[PDB]
Design a binder for this molecule. Structure first.
Ligand SMILES: NC(=O)[C@H]1CCCN(C(=O)[C@@H]2SCc3cccnc32)C1
Ligand SMILES: [Zn+2]
Length: 139
């Protein structure tokens, strides 16, 4: 679990969005596993606007942060799960690192700010949904 809170927006994995997220929907994209909802309180986070490919993510299944090298956002095949059919997920970045079911929502940050959130994983892989292209989060 986990979310980004920036301005009057809350960014979560679309597959973990709550009834309240959907009732205050701003934007969602199943192909990216992202959903943004509106908030009444001002958010605590700031978004990176950069091309970094290294950073640090929070892994809830280890209660620890790990450094990662990750690929540029791209279209990657993701196997079927209870949440989605087998499909290509866009704006996804892969890295070698631990992740397991429950770790989605953990933040990936570089020196500039929040880069994205955990969205997929595999045998020693972790995948992050990029948010750096969502310029409107800052306005
Ligand atoms: N974006 C998606 O389509 C997700 C939806 C939830 C299930 N998916 C996963 O990858 C799980 S959750 C993190 C993790 C880590 C190791 C193995 N499996 C997983 C795919
Ligand atoms: Zn950066």
């Amino acid at each position: 679990s986990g979310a980004i809170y920036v301005g009057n927006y809350r960014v979560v994995n679309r597959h973990l969005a709550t009834h309240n997220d959907w009732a205050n929907l701003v934007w969602e994209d199943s192909s990216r596993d992202l959903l943004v909802s509106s908030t009444t309180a001002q958010g605590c986070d700031t978004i990176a606007r950069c091309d970094c490919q290294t950073g640090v993510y929070y892994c809830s299944s280890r209660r620890k942060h790990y450094p990662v090298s990750f690929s540029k956002p791209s279209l990657i095949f993701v196997e079927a799960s209870e949440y989605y059919p087998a499909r290509y997920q866009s704006h996804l970045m892969l890295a070698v690192g631990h992740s397991e079911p429950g770790d989605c929502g953990g933040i990936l940050r570089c020196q500039h700010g929040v880069v994205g959130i955990v969205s997929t994983g595999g045998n020693g892989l972790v995948g992050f949904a990029d948010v750096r292209d969502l310029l409107w989060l800052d306005e």
